[PDB]
Structure formats: C-alpha cells, structure tokens
C-alpha cells in the first residue's frame, strides 16, 4: 500500500512473491493479503474523512479524491481509501 517514501526492488519483488505463501493460507484457504496492522476499528459507516499527525512520503493511492497525506490529509475519503497506516504519524484521530 505504502512502500518506501524514497537489485533491491528485485529482492523486494521476490520477498513480495515469497510472502504470497503467507497470503494464500491467510484470510482463507484461497488467500487474503490480510489486515494485521490497521483497523482494530470495529467497522462503522464507510464514508467519513481522515486526520493525521504530519505523515510524509505521500503514497496514498487508495480510492480517494485527493488526500495529501499529512495532518489534515482530509477530504471525503471512504473506507476503501483509509486502510493504509497507523503509527508513522497518523492516529491521533479518525
């Protein structure tokens, strides 16, 4: 979802393919890139905006209009968008 803010990419792609094994059994027999690090949220209504604590790198490619990922990266962003990060400068708030 958010790689590095900046042949290692080949090793990262190999590690991403190696992690597939985990993903296959994870979530189901068939497989789910499984949520492990975000939304201990009970899921509530899907369309309310965001707030951060001065995030940096700006990789949010998730389904929103434009978020501009730092504190007050805040636009009408649905649940599909907001599934990114926790403790890299974000979660004072939802």
């Amino acid at each position: 979802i958010i790689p590095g803010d900046i042949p290692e990419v080949t090793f990262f792609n190999n590690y991403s393919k190696s992690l597939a094994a985990y993903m296959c059994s994870a979530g189901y027999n068939q497989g789910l890139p499984i949520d492990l690090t975000n939304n201990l949220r009970p899921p509530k209504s899907l369309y309310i905006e965001v707030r951060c604590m001065e995030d940096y790198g700006k990789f949010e490619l998730d389904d929103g209009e434009v978020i501009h990922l730092k504190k007050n990266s805040q636009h009408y962003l649905p649940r599909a968008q907001v599934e990114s990060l926790v403790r890299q400068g974000i979660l004072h708030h939802i």
Partner: peptide
C-alpha cells in the same frame, strides 16, 4: 465509541 460510531471533528 459507545454506539460504535467512527467520527470526525
């Protein structure tokens, strides 16, 4: 968070 509502302020 009592009635399980996520919020924004």
């Amino acid at each position: 968070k009592y009635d399980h509502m996520l919020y924004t302020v």
